[PDB]
Design an enzyme around this catalytic site. Sequence first.
Site, short mmCIF file in Angstrom:
data_model
loop_
_atom_site.label_atom_id
_atom_site.label_comp_id
_atom_site.label_asym_id
_atom_site.label_seq_id
_atom_site.Cartn_x
_atom_site.Cartn_y
_atom_site.Cartn_z
N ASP A 142 75.99 59.52 58.91
CA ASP A 142 75.68 58.12 58.67
C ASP A 142 74.42 57.75 59.47
O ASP A 142 74.36 57.89 60.70
CB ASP A 142 76.82 57.19 59.10
CG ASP A 142 76.50 55.73 58.83
OD1 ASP A 142 76.63 55.36 57.65
OD2 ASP A 142 76.11 55.02 59.78
N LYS A 147 70.84 52.99 55.07
CA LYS A 147 71.05 51.56 54.96
C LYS A 147 69.69 50.83 54.99
O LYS A 147 68.82 51.18 55.81
CB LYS A 147 71.95 50.96 56.03
CG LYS A 147 73.17 51.78 56.37
CD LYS A 147 74.14 51.22 57.36
CE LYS A 147 75.08 52.29 57.79
NZ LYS A 147 74.51 53.06 58.95
N1 LIG Z 1 77.03 49.38 59.22
C1 LIG Z 1 76.84 48.84 60.40
O1 LIG Z 1 76.57 47.67 60.63
C2 LIG Z 1 77.27 49.71 61.61
C3 LIG Z 1 77.53 49.10 62.88
C4 LIG Z 1 77.93 49.89 64.00
C5 LIG Z 1 78.07 51.27 63.80
N2 LIG Z 1 77.79 51.82 62.49
C6 LIG Z 1 77.86 53.34 62.32
O2 LIG Z 1 79.12 53.74 62.90
C7 LIG Z 1 78.97 54.80 63.94
C8 LIG Z 1 80.06 54.77 64.98
O3 LIG Z 1 80.07 53.47 65.65
P1 LIG Z 1 79.45 53.30 67.12
O4 LIG Z 1 78.24 54.15 67.30
O5 LIG Z 1 79.27 51.83 67.23
O6 LIG Z 1 80.59 53.72 68.16
P2 LIG Z 1 81.87 54.70 68.21
O7 LIG Z 1 81.72 55.83 67.30
O8 LIG Z 1 83.09 53.87 68.19
O9 LIG Z 1 81.78 55.15 69.76
C9 LIG Z 1 80.71 56.00 70.17
C10 LIG Z 1 80.82 56.05 71.73
O10 LIG Z 1 81.93 56.85 72.02
C11 LIG Z 1 81.62 58.00 72.77
N3 LIG Z 1 82.45 59.08 72.32
C12 LIG Z 1 82.38 59.82 71.15
N4 LIG Z 1 83.30 60.75 71.04
C13 LIG Z 1 84.01 60.62 72.22
C14 LIG Z 1 85.12 61.39 72.64
N5 LIG Z 1 85.69 62.38 71.96
N6 LIG Z 1 85.64 61.02 73.90
C15 LIG Z 1 85.09 60.00 74.65
N7 LIG Z 1 84.01 59.25 74.23
C16 LIG Z 1 83.48 59.61 72.98
C17 LIG Z 1 80.16 58.25 72.53
O11 LIG Z 1 79.52 58.90 73.63
P3 LIG Z 1 78.41 60.06 73.56
O12 LIG Z 1 77.64 59.89 72.28
O13 LIG Z 1 77.55 59.92 74.82
O14 LIG Z 1 79.18 61.41 73.54
C18 LIG Z 1 79.62 56.81 72.39
O15 LIG Z 1 79.39 56.17 73.66
C19 LIG Z 1 77.52 54.47 64.41
O16 LIG Z 1 76.88 55.44 65.21
C20 LIG Z 1 76.84 54.12 63.10
O17 LIG Z 1 76.48 55.33 62.41
C21 LIG Z 1 77.40 51.09 61.37
O1 LIG Z 2 73.54 47.45 62.52
C1 LIG Z 2 74.11 48.43 63.09
O2 LIG Z 2 74.36 49.44 62.37
C2 LIG Z 2 74.44 48.42 64.54
C3 LIG Z 2 73.68 47.33 65.29
N1 LIG Z 2 74.35 46.26 65.48
N2 LIG Z 2 73.75 45.23 66.15
C4 LIG Z 2 74.64 44.07 66.29
C5 LIG Z 2 74.28 43.27 64.95
N3 LIG Z 2 74.98 42.31 64.44
C6 LIG Z 2 74.47 41.74 63.25
C7 LIG Z 2 75.05 40.69 62.51
C8 LIG Z 2 74.40 40.26 61.36
C9 LIG Z 2 75.02 39.14 60.57
F1 LIG Z 2 75.16 39.46 59.26
F2 LIG Z 2 76.30 38.99 60.84
F3 LIG Z 2 74.41 38.02 60.67
C10 LIG Z 2 73.22 40.82 60.93
C11 LIG Z 2 72.62 41.84 61.62
C12 LIG Z 2 73.27 42.29 62.78
S1 LIG Z 2 72.86 43.53 63.92
C13 LIG Z 2 72.46 45.25 66.66
O3 LIG Z 2 71.99 44.28 67.25
C14 LIG Z 2 71.74 46.46 66.43
C15 LIG Z 2 70.42 46.56 66.91
C16 LIG Z 2 69.73 47.74 66.69
C17 LIG Z 2 70.32 48.82 65.99
C18 LIG Z 2 71.60 48.72 65.53
C19 LIG Z 2 72.33 47.53 65.75
#
Ligand SMILES: NC(=O)c1ccc[n+]([C@@H]2O[C@H](COP(=O)([O-])OP(=O)(O)OC[C@H]3O[C@@H](n4cnc5c(N)ncnc54)[C@H](OP(=O)(O)O)[C@@H]3O)[C@@H](O)[C@H]2O)c1
Ligand SMILES: O=C(O)Cc1nn(Cc2nc3cc(C(F)(F)F)ccc3s2)c(=O)c2ccccc12
Length: 314
Positions: A42, A76
């Site tokens: 992702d 994205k």
């Molecule tokens: N669509 C969106 O708006 C959106 C928003 C947020 C996230 N996302 C996607 O979702 C992914 C996952 O969410 P996230 O990055 O927010 O956080 P997450 O996956 O919930 O947590 C990642 C954190 O957990 C640690 N970690 C990973 N595996 C671990 C394990 N086995 N034991 C202990 N700690 C561990 C990592 O550390 P280290 O890396 O240092 O090992 C990092 O600090 C993102 O990277 C992104 O691709 C999308």
């Molecule tokens: O985006 C990621 O994947 C992780 C992500 N999350 N956020 C928190 C956010 N909260 C939001 C809420 C809205 C809203 F729609 F709700 F207004 C719109 C946009 C955003 S960014 C960040 O500020 C951010 C900054 C840099 C890179 C990744 C991120």
Amino acid sequence: SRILLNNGAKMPILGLGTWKSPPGQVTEAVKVAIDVGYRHIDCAHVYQNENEVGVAIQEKLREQVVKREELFIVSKLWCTYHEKGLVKGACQKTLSDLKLDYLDLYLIHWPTGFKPGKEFFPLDESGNVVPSDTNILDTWAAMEELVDEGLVKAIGISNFNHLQVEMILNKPGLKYKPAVNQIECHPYLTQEKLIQYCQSKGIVVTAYSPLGSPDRPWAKPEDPSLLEDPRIKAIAAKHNKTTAQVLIRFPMQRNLVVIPKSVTPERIAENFKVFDFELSSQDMTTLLSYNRNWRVCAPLSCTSHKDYPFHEEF
Ligand SMILES: NC(=O)c1ccc[n+]([C@@H]2O[C@H](COP(=O)([O-])OP(=O)(O)OC[C@H]3O[C@@H](n4cnc5c(N)ncnc54)[C@H](OP(=O)(O)O)[C@@H]3O)[C@@H](O)[C@H]2O)c1
Ligand SMILES: O=C(O)Cc1nn(Cc2nc3cc(C(F)(F)F)ccc3s2)c(=O)c2ccccc12
């Protein structure tokens, strides 16, 4: 290991997240992820590391570890590119950085359009996000053109509430239904109503921040910490697994896709070792009972946007 999408393709239910993965380390993370079996990565332009993710995929294709068809690559459309004239360019930037000729899935990253410009988070003099005057439907139509041009195999949405999804489904002259809705989901934010809605419409849900995003840059020390919750540690210990492993297996048994992030090789391998056990009925019930409606991603700075998704119940 895969879930069927409404475009006929299968999506690996376990992927590698890459937000906050430095270019310093993400090449290595992806190479290792691929070595231990991940096939879904992702990505996002806003994560500022797609080149380096690209580097890792290209090398492993060349080493003959994996072929392209076996990889499921997601990116994205960031908020500053919602204008219909900016969408193809934004996708092609992503494609070029990733060194790919197609994406398996391209998402509208947030329902909210921000002022177009160089800055990813344009703020005014006083810190409010500056919106753009785009709307969801026009942006969706632009996403549809990418499928029809062969740049992306499927399109979907992220952080859309059920009314925003309904807007798309009810679009007169819709060409493609969203395939995926990627939303925050974990035991403190269990999303029961939005998941029930999406799955009832044949939209696959991807759970992000499944471990609670402990590395989120706005974390407060008093915030709840999933990975340190002793109640979850106790479920983990009973199964002889880590809490991360429990937290990853949890959405898998809800028929969700899950995308835990790590740049630590040992954790990248650990996190994938979740197809050799099951959470029981009581475990699932127990974990759902921890819901508190707590979000990692929900900034005050966006709450006045017309399309802010989190005013609605779900
Ligand atoms: N669509 C969106 O708006 C959106 C928003 C947020 C996230 N996302 C996607 O979702 C992914 C996952 O969410 P996230 O990055 O927010 O956080 P997450 O996956 O919930 O947590 C990642 C954190 O957990 C640690 N970690 C990973 N595996 C671990 C394990 N086995 N034991 C202990 N700690 C561990 C990592 O550390 P280290 O890396 O240092 O090992 C990092 O600090 C993102 O990277 C992104 O691709 C999308
Ligand atoms: O985006 C990621 O994947 C992780 C992500 N999350 N956020 C928190 C956010 N909260 C939001 C809420 C809205 C809203 F729609 F709700 F207004 C719109 C946009 C955003 S960014 C960040 O500020 C951010 C900054 C840099 C890179 C990744 C991120």
